[PDB]
Amino acid sequence: LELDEQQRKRLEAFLTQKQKVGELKDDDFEKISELGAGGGVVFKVSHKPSGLVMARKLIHLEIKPAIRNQIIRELQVLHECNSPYIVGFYGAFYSDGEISICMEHMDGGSLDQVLKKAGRIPEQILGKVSIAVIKGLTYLREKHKIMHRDVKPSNILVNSRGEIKLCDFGVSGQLIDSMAVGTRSYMSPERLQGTHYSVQSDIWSMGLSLVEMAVGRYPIPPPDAKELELMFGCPMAIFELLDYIVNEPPPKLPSGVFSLEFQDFVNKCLIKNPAERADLKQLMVHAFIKRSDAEEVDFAGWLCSTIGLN
Numbered sequence: 001l002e003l004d005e006q007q008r009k010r011l012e013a014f015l016t017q018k019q020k021v022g023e024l025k026d027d028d029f030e031k032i033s034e035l036g037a038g039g040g041v042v043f044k045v046s047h048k049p050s051g052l053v054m055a056r057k058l059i060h061l062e063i064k065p066a067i068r069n070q071i072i073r074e075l076q077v078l079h080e081c082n083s084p085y086i087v088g089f090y091g092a093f094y095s096d097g098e099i100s101i102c103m104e105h106m107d108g109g110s111l112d113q114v115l116k117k118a119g120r121i122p123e124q125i126l127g128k129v130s131i132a133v134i135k136g137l138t139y140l141r142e143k144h145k146i147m148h149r150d151v152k153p154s155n156i157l158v159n160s161r162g163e164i165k166l167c168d169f170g171v172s173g174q175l176i177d178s179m180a181v182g183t184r185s186y187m188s189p190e191r192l193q194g195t196h197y198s199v200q201s202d203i204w205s206m207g208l209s210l211v212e213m214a215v216g217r218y219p220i221p222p223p224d225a226k227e228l229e230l231m232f233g234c235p236m237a238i239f240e241l242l243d244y245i246v247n248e249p250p251p252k253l254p255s256g257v258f259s260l261e262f263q264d265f266v267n268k269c270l271i272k273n274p275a276e277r278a279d280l281k282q283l284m285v286h287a288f289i290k291r292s293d294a295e296e297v298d299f300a301g302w303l304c305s306t307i308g309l310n
C-alpha cells in the first residue's frame with residue numbers, strides 16, 4: 001500500500017480541503033444535478049460556504065432519533081479511510097427524513113455508466129481497473145479490517161485525473177438493518193448459499209464485474225454462438241439467475257479476443273470454491289497484474305475520449 005509522490009500529494013490536498021469544511025448542514029447545500037440512483041439517489045451538490053463541489057447520497061428513511069444518531073456515529077469510521085483507491089468522504093448527517101453521505105465528486109461517474117457509453121472496456125483499461133480494485137480491497141482489509149461486501153461496476157468510480165476508486169462499502173450495521181435493496185447479481189456462490197464468506201467473496205464480484213465490462217453484457221447466462229458473432233465479429237428472472245450462479249459453471253471470457261493472462265486472471269477470481277479462488281496477495285503478483293502495472297496506459301485519455309468529458 002506504499003504511495004507514489006503524486007498520490008501522497010492528492011491525498012494531502014484532499015484532507016487540507018476537508019479540514020476547512022466543518023460540520024455539514026442541510027441548508028449549506030445547493031443541488032447542481034443528479035449523478036445516479038439506486039435505495040438512495042446521488043446528487044452533485046455545491047457546499048455553498050466552502051465552495052466545494054461534492055457528491056451527496058440521500059437515503060430516505062423514517063427512523064426515531066435513537067436510530068439515526070447511532071447510524072451517524074457508525075459512519076464516522078469513513079473519516080479514517082484515507083487511500084488513493086477509496087472515494088473521499090466529507091461527512092454524514094440526518095435531515096428531514098433522510099441520511100446524507102457526502103463524498104468526493106468523481107467526474108467520470110461509475111463504471112456501469114462508463115460501460116453503457118463505451119459498449120465494452122478494453123483489456124488494458126481493465127488492467128488498471130483491476131489494480132485499483134485489488135489495492136482498494138487490500139487497504140480496507142489491512143488498515144481497517146473490513147471487507148467491501150458490494151463490489152460491482154456501479155461501486156467503482158472514475159475521474160478525469162485517471163483515478164479509480166471504490167465506494168459504498170457497508171460500515172454501519174444499523175444503516176443496513178434499517179434498510180432490510182441493491183442487486184444480488186454480483187454475489188459469490190458461497191454468499192448466495194449462506195455459507196462461509198470472507199474477502200474471497202469480493203474477489204468473485206470483481207471477477208464478474210471485469211467479465212461484464214470486457215464483453216459489454218452481464219455475463220450470466222453465457223452468450224450463445226450467434227450472440228458472440230454480434231459482439232466481436234468472430235429472459236432470466238433474478239431468482240433464476242441466482243440459482244444459475246450457485247449451480248452452474250462460472251462465466252468466462254471468450255477465447256481468441258482476450259489475452260490468456262487476462263483470461264487466466266478472471267478464471268482465478270471466478271473459481272466457485274472460495275478456498276481454491278485466488279486471494280488478494282496472489283492477485284497482486286498475477287501475470288496480468290504485473291503486466292498491467294508495467295504498461296503505461298493513458299486511462300484519463302481513454303476515459304475523456306469515450307464519455308465525451310471536456
Ligand SMILES: N#Cc1cccc2[nH]nc(N)c12
Nearest residue numbers: 035036042055104105106109
Ligand atoms: N454515480 C455516482 C456516485 C455515487 C457515489 C459517490 C460518488 N461520487 N462521485 C460520483 N459520481 C458518485
Ligand code: NA
Nearest residue numbers: 150168170182
Ligand atoms: Na450497496
